Design a binder for this molecule. Structure first.
Ligand SMILES: [Mg+2]
Ligand SMILES: [Mg+2]
Ligand SMILES: [Zn+2]
Lengths: 225, 132, 343, 103
RNA sequence: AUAUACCGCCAUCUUCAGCAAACCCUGAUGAAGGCUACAAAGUAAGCGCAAGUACCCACGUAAAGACGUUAGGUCAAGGUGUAGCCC
């Protein structure tokens, strides 16, 4: 009898509301513009699959349409908040050595996990052998940088697609958003933009966890009486 | 290639006990001797007789407990005593084990003219130190 | 000499010659060969030629509430006991010799079509008793290595399917055939496609695709038509759960190319519901057996279009010469429509 | 006397089950294309050939017009036609008997 | 009689560092391939090296030295398959 009401009133309650966690408050187009999110690489480095998200080139410098970025970021933050609310494992991945410390620190602070080092072969496709069969794979992977240091797509994207793990991702003008479940077109090299992404994701995850705790406490209190 | 008393790895599945796993160069390093008697010490005598007795005891005990032995014997000698310590699987009913213990003790005592004790430690199965 | 005797294990190791260069190479033919036997299969402790009955070892220690004494069986009963032991050993050997046959594949000496049972269960409550495994080809690939020269290995292509639209295939390379089977099926169970089936018995529409150099032309067929397809396609369709279908394979008949092209074509097919959603129109089925009654098999879930689809008098499609020749009856063939076993 | 009772018996359910009597039969022949006509008869002067047909390999299967349960297995449930002999592997004699019984 | 049936004990490369399973990935799921440390698909275990130990140290010398190569040596250490001998 406990499950029949617990499952509904906790798990399925946020799924009815469009924005349960009010992630739209966190960011604004003005804020993204101030964080230099719209900047992209030169037209030569452009990846064709990123053409729909490119507003236009400013003197052979692609500008990322922040109108589309706002909607994509809304979807991605809402998805991340819902996954955190369901206590799913969230793994940040970014091989960019500049932000490795910041990303690891943010992941540790928000209670989620980070992998900013050399992604060993089969860390996901061979996780059962590398960790023991009882290991629990991440339920959501967030790429703050979808390219490795040789500018090829991160192998973790393909591996997560193989293991059916949804991927939130910051795709730049030269990135490949084909297999990323929730692409977020935006600048991934500017320190301001990366800091903005880290703040937004940390805030969404923390809000989701706090809301989960509050809802669990309220449901347990009301069920007793 | 050295072949003495070594268990060569074949597939990674064959189980071996602690003694079978260790090679001869590990004797007195990681595994003790299976027979303890003052014969081989400095100045002592009758080493050959003790060695023959030990070989016969091992053969007799292996042939007297068919498949019961789970490991090599340990032949301790204190004075004229002779303790045979063995590790045996829990296959036979204890009646047969007790019958064999009494039999072997009496027969060996009358055959070697020394009080022979037989101490059995039972194990559910052959202890596996590793797989080769 | 007693001290010169050895143990049973050492004697078997020496006599059987299980190891050594002869086993590795096999230059010396061993049709006249020895096999291992358990000398202690039925031996009872306390039984011997003299036929003695030792209380507590081979006869009950207490009989009628009293301890038995050392007794020796008579010569007649001891002879009977020895004969009974011999007969029991013979019966054990006879039971060992007997066995049960299996079902051959496509041909009596081909691995194709032979079932391998369900894939091995997963680590944590992940079992696949619903799945069946079938071999599509086994090949002895010989690789030239620097030291050993020609080295034999087995490459096996298997397909696994539960019969309910979920199926996949995989390749397995090994040194032993059974290891290849295990690898291939345990990997194929992770690469499962989902083949949408019309009415759970056939494909949704006619398919014609070329993979590399292999052309596969599959035709949707009504119930009871059976599987008239290449034997590999028959096996894969049974694994998927397709009962009625036609299929002609042209070009190279490479088994792997054929298999993965078949899976590609089956996976990429479009359902009636998808078609209705795409074009926003009712998908109306017309059956000759049902007369002019229009049967709606799929309706768009969104808005329904009001403008009728343009009715071109001449459709612009690429027909097949084989299909046209068959329809016109000029496709004379002494091999087409030959009566064949049930599929 | 009552051929239909066998198909309701537990022995029939054990040997066959829900599948038709010819589900497990497989003709022995050379080549991938079988001969376009099955053997003339499995029973030759009261002797049985090596691989008897589904009907001949089970003496309790009586091809009688009242045994409609058995006859339904040799008629396509979707099209209503009678399977040709190579489809089920039945011999020509038993196939003719099945056709007459079905009619 | 057969080391060209073997066990047992060894030689040789070895004054080697690799080997073999179990997976994972790439090549469109072709034979095949799988390395970059400011790292780019390889890997948790096993064997060997290594480590540990013996001798006088942490050095050195011993010991160890996998898999595999030479149908290497031994049927005359012993055991044993097959074959042969039994005035
Ligand atoms: Mg960038
Ligand atoms: Mg044959
Ligand atoms: Zn017949």
């Amino acid at each position: 009898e406990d499950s029949t009401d617990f499952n509904d009133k906790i798990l399925n309650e946020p799924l009815k509301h469009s924005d349960f966690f009010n992630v739209k408050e966190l960011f604004s187009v003005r804020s993204l513009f101030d964080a230099r999110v719209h900047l992209g690489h030169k037209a030569g480095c452009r990846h064709r699959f990123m053409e729909p998200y490119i507003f236009g080139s400013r003197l052979d410098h692609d500008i990322i349409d922040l109108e589309q970025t706002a909607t994509h970021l809304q979807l991605a933050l809402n998805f991340t908040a819902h996954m955190a609310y369901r206590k799913g494992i969230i793994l940040f991945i970014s091989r960019n050595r500049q932000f490795s410390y910041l990303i690891e620190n943010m992941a540790r602070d928000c209670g989620e996990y980070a992998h900013t080092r050399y992604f060993r072969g089969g860390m996901l496709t061979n996780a059962r052998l590398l960790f023991g069969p009882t290991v629990r794979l991440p339920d959501l992977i967030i790429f703050l940088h979808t390219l490795n240091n040789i500018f090829e797509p991160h192998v973790a994207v393909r591996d997560a697609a193989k293991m059916n793990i949804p991927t939130v991702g910051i795709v730049d003008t030269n990135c490949n958003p084909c297999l990323i479940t929730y692409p977020v077109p935006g600048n991934d090299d500017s320190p301001l933009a990366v800091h903005l992404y880290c703040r937004l994701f940390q805030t969404a995850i923390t809000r989701a966890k706090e809301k989960r705790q509050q809802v669990e406490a309220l449901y347990r209190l009301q069920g007793q009486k | 290639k050295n072949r003495a008393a070594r268990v060569r790895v074949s597939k990674g599945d064959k189980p071996v006990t602690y003694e079978e796993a260790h090679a001869p160069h590990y004797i007195a390093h990681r595994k003790g001797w299976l027979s303890l008697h003052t014969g081989n010490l400095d100045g002592e005598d009758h080493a050959a007789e003790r060695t023959v007795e030990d070989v016969f005891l091992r053969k007799f005990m292996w042939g007297t407990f068919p498949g019961c032995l789970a490991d090599q014997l340990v032949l301790k000698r204190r004075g004229n005593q002779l303790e045979i310590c063995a590790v045996v699987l829990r296959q036979l009913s204890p009646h047969k084990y007790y019958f064999l213990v009494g039999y072997s003790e009496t027969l060996l005592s009358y055959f070697y003219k020394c009080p022979v004790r037989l101490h059995l430690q039972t194990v559910p199965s052959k202890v596996v130190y590793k797989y080769l | 000499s007693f001290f010169t005797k050895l143990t049973a294990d050492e004697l078997w190791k020496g006599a059987l010659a299980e190891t050594g260069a002869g086993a590795k190479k096999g230059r010396g033919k061993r049709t006249k060969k020895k096999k291992r036997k358990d000398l202690n299969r039925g031996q009872i402790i306390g039984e011997g030629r003299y036929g003695f009955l030792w209380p507590g070892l081979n006869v009950p220690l207490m009989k009628n509430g009293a301890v038995q004494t050392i007794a020796q069986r008579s010569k007649e009963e001891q002879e009977k006991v020895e004969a009974d032991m011999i007969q029991q050993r013979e019966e054990w050997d006879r039971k060992k010799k007997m066995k049960v046959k299996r079902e051959r594949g496509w041909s009596g000496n081909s691995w194709g079509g032979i079932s391998l049972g369900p894939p091995d269960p997963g680590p944590c409550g992940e079992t696949y008793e619903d799945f069946d495994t079938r071999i599509l080809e086994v090949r002895n690939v010989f690789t030239m290595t620097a030291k050993e020269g020609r080295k034999k290995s087995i490459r096996v292509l298997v397909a696994v399917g539960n019969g309910k639209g979920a199926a996949g295939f995989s390749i397995g390379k090994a040194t032993d055939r059974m290891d290849a089977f295990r690898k291939a099926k345990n990997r194929a169970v992770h690469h499962l496609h989902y083949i949408e089936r019309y009415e759970d018995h056939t494909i949704f529409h006619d398919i014609s695709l070329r993979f590399k150099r292999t052309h596969i032309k599959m035709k949707k067929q009504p119930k009871g038509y059976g599987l008239r397809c290449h034997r590999a396609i028959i096996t894969i369709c049974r694994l998927i759960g397709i009962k009625d279908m036609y299929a002609k394979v042209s070009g190279s008949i490479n088994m792997l190319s054929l298999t993965q092209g078949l899976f590609r074509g089956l996976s990429r097919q479009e359902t009636h519901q998808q078609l209705a959603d795409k074009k926003g129109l009712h998908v109306v089925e017309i059956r000759e057996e049902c007369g002019p009654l229009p049967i709606v098999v799929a309706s768009p879930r969104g808005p329904l279009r009001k403008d009728p689809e343009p009715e071109d008098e001449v459709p612009d499609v690429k027909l097949d010469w084989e299909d046209v020749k068959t329809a016109q009856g000029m496709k004379r063939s002494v091999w087409s429509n030959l009566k064949r076993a049930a599929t | 006397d009552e051929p239909w009772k066998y198909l309701e018996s537990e022995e029939y359910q054990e040997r066959y089950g829900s599948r038709p009597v010819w589900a497990d039969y497989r003709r022995n022949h050379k080549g991938g294309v079988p001969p376009q006509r099955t053997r003339k008869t499995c029973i030759r002067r009261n002797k049985v050939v090596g691989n008897p047909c589904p009907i001949c390999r089970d003496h309790k299967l009586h091809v009688d017009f009242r045994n409609v349960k058995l006859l339904e297995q040799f008629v396509c449930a979707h099209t209503g036609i009678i399977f040709y002999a190579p489809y089920t592997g039945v011999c020509v004699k038993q196939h003719k008997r099945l056709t007459q019984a079905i009619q």
